[PDB]
Amino acid sequence: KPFTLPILTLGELTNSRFPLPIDVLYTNPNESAIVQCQNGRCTLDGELQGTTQLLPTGICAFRGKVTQQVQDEHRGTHWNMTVTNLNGTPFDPTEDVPAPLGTPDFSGQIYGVISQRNTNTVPGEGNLPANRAHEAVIATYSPKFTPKLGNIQFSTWETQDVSSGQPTKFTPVGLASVDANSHFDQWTLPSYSGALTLNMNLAPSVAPVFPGECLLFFRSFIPLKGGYGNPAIDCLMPQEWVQHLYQESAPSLSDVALVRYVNPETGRTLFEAKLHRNGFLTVARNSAGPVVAPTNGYFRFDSWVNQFYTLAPM
Amino acid sequence: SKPFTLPILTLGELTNSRFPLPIDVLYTNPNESAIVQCQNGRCTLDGELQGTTQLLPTGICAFRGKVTQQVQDEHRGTHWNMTVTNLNGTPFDPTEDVPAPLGTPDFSGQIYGVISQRNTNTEGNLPANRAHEAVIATYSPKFTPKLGNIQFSTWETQDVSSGQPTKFTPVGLASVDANSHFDQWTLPSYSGALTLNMNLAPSVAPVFPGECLLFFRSFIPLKGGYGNPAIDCLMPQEWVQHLYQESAPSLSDVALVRYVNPETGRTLFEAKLHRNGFLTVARNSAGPVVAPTNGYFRFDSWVNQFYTLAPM
């Protein structure tokens, strides 16, 4: 079965690591961190890895139940919530994944909304349940961030109106802050089972091997609740590619696919890239920053090549 | 002729095309009195997007633009006038043959979400940001997205900036009380109340007796109050994306599809997938379809509109 990519253009793609549109292609050759994100991880023959799942709505989402308000040294009102799988089934800590699928894969203060729809109903309200929603922040670097253990902590500005024991949804919106104390680092993994514990079942790190090549990312700018900053989240492949590869399950015929970024209006190749078996791109570029190209561009699969192939410089 | 196909995503791998929600259940309501004419999640089987439908899951019920004016509510809250652009940032051209900017909500209600802003200009060199909860009343006379401007309301009374890039991220509904006018089949008046909506995707309905529409239903969060609101789409967003990609010619008015249990390989029921992009089943009851969420629709064959469905 022939390998293919979707023909979605850049303006028709979304980020696999946060629910955002793709804004720009981006490189950063001098990156010192190990790149080992756990969302948006899928091999070219369709094997999901890390905490990757298929739903755009599941990325950095949680589902579970608040248990109680809990004490924390930091500003705001804090709440513990048990988390299930996103489909509502209990999370089994013995499954070979790093954390429930969809769990955030970076250090930071994730801003969003916690909502609740009670289980118990009121006969006088037409047998309908009570609801509430409030802004919330999940500090994924917190020692109380233990999604692999089945529970996480979030904070609210709201001091009282979060109910114990009720079905709870976290909808991610952006970051609370990127100030010095907010520990935003997109390449630092949370400790999924808590402070001082080793993460397990991780999708592998990715890196260029060939001289003069660097990783190519699909970058999205992420909203901020407050403060100064222009934070971005870089993914290895957009969510649509994860969905496409998963569907197709086409055998990989070598370790490296040649892809060309094409202008569909002019028919011209703007540059070429290696699409590696483990699900990431490299290009021959010697600079950091955006790739300035029209957002109607798209990657076209050309052929299977190998580690010895020399890319034309971008 | 390029063969027609559906994705092999199961129900638990699908999302709603009318609000950013996972699909929870398949659903019927044969006795629905409303005309069904939603404008998001509209795609013909040969890949033609219709209504306000666009491809991004992040674009559904999203807005992008700039705030122009602050107006205090007479009682509580603050209203903000927002010019809106296309989601890709380009100016919205009201002369384009669409009902409203793609992604515009397609139902009456108070849509609850978060307005966020990242300023354009900067003596530090990083832009200032803010976000607050917001509500967009799509039934409001000030909801005129086809004219390039809408209004949202906030609890926040001051901290929303004019002339700065603004994003609305939808989250759910503010209320489904009587005074909140939630009706998922009532279209907003995209240009205001006394004006006719234009360029609409057509209404959908069974043509053959004994059939009813089959929906992909999602439950939508509420900011407050009592309720268990739901939003029904004709096809999930992944089907819109797939059909658009494939652009396979339609070889009859109807693609017969079977909902299959892959564990047993058995067909649970069959449905008609109509050319204009919607499902009907032979069912004479309302409510969820009780089936495993690892079930999925498989394309069987092109059939005629006169084909008689096996009763569910």
Ligand SMILES: C[C@@H]1O[C@H](O)[C@@H](O)[C@H](O)[C@@H]1O
């Ligand atoms: C719920 C809280 O309301 C306050 O007025 C705001 O200043 C905070 O940002 C937060 O939204």
Ligand SMILES: C[C@@H]1O[C@H](O)[C@@H](O)[C@H](O)[C@@H]1O
């Ligand atoms: C930099 C400042 O951050 C704060 O949280 C906001 O409330 C202000 O509007 C401003 O953007």
Ligand SMILES: C[C@@H]1O[C@H](O)[C@@H](O)[C@H](O)[C@@H]1O
């Ligand atoms: C910003 C507003 O803060 C208040 O405390 C809350 O009661 C409202 O629901 C809203 O979130």
Ligand SMILES: C[C@@H]1O[C@H](O)[C@@H](O)[C@H](O)[C@@H]1O
């Ligand atoms: C019915 C009530 O709606 C309000 O908005 C909420 O703040 C309460 O917790 C409760 O659910």
